[PDB]
């Protein structure tokens, strides 16, 4: 795309141009895109949740909803505040099941301040229904859409249904080219605050004068550069991951399982999942709260015979996200589950999804799947 | 000026993040370095590695930015803050003081090299030391700074680096956190990246952070890292030639003996003599205090910014914050004289000694 050219253009007028050019264009991409009206650009998506969850008024302490089969990043911000974490599991969806969020809200003694929503591998979750029982029980509604920005539901841009929304834009491998994140939200006072807090908290004197402590979580202009870049391609992008999607379904539809997207949902597909030996009566065994411990998952045999074949042929693939409620860093944690975000681990794997990718190589890939699992 | 040739080349496809830790190891001669996307980032992660909890004492200077404090506010620690001396650091014999005075034994110290000048190394060193205190040292604008020929940031146990400034919103960014136990920095290389157990799936046995810095920028600071020395000679240059035009109105005071600043930022004080150092010792319980600049600094920033030049107050005090209300101080009355008296004048390498001239001959003129 254009990242050379304007980070040409930030170096190049750096001396004269208006201050964090960039950075202004980048979150104005966002809010023409989302239709949020408030956006504000930050190293990370985590540190986008952590500004959420502070401003939200989140203590140590407080109880903090999230969902289980998630990425650690999503709930770390939990942990920072001191607060505490109560993990539910997952629907058909890849997303917080409605009926397990119910009963973890109802047998809360304490009431939870808020609920940090993953749309996973950016699936829409059951909106409709999450943002009613938010509204009814006074819960702030965090959308964690780092993996989900393209991704629609009812033709709004997920991100857009809580009183905060979050993005990311880079994938997350240990170390990525770019980096960065975009908080947008519905009151524009609060995210004026995190705008405050994202550059230490420094009132508006000729020296520097603080009441507050703040951290350095504001994006650079040279990242915002490559974040306006990223957004002119967004669309396409979105339509190319969605037709490799399709693809993979169409070559391996025979033995893995493509879980439908929400009934009028777009789902931006940015990384493309399946399941083998899977039938949706498999769904939903169990429904029953814990206090975590660590334990770990085993993989279906050809799940892990595809990954190591596939490792041979130069391909990488991956298992799913590995659930919170088996994790050692939160051991003691409450937990609902209903057992599908463990099952969706041992059957579940994750597709090479760049959209550089041809039709061909899709194919090629899923010609070395069907060799593996026969 | 390489960083477009860096950022052309990781396009076209970590390569960067490494050379750019390398650079810093090559410079400095520390053993371990890791790079972060800031250095409160890398100030914070010290911190935990080193072992401070909720409640723990951690010392700090007091004349220093508030980005080089805010962590130990993250770890809910109780800070504790030092006044200076005449190298713009925190004093020695306060710092004995708050040691002996202090309730429970403090686990780490936070020394900040204001404006590039190496502090009391050999004394800070040892005190730290024969007290079992973690010296962890804040060279965020001390890069290319030295006491008896050793780089600044690798006398503690942890040392950080920042690149850009500290402007609202900076074109690159990132920081750096060296040290001299590998096991330590490669803990922190592990809470860098979300605490993610080496396999195949996440696994996770504690919590961390998404603090590594991306490739790009690391292009960045390699670039930055290659013309450093040439930028701190220029840097020191520029220091000389503003002694040299406004010596007999402004004070510029020595570095210590047998040291280098890297004088990152230009600074001095108007109608300023030593005698009136250590003048009001004391250590208080914080509360917000304005201090009022000195007439002729008040007017001088005023002249020079109608005439299109950008000068700045020093740093304003923690001790005299809000946010550490109640907090503990112990003080000299330096840090606060400093800010009534000092100005922080424009130090861009780019400029020529005739530009340095010009700006001397409006500030001449401006204090009559
Ligand atoms: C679902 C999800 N939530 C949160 C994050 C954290 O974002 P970041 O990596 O930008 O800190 C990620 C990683 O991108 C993610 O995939
Ligand atoms: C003296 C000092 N300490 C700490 C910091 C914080 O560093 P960063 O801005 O890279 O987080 C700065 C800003 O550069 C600084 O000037």
Known sequence: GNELKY???VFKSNYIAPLGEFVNRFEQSVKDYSKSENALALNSATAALHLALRVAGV????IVLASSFTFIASVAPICYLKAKPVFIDCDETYNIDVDLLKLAIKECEKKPKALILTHLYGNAAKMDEIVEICKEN???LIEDAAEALGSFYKNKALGTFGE???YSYNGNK???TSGGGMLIGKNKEKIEKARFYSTQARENCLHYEHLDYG???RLSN???AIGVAQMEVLEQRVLKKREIYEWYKEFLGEYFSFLDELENSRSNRWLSTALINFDKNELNACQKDINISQKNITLHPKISKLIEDLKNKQIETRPLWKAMHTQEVFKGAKA???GNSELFFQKGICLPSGTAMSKDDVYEISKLILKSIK
């Open 174 to 176: 240990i170390i990525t």
């Open 215 to 217: 951290y350095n979580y």
């Open 164 to 166: 905060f929304g979050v």
């Open 222 to 224: 040279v990242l915002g």
């Open 336 to 338: 609902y589950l209903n």
């Open 7 to 9: 980070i040409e253009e």
């Open 59 to 62: 203590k140590q302490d407080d």
């Open 138 to 140: 006074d819960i702030v």
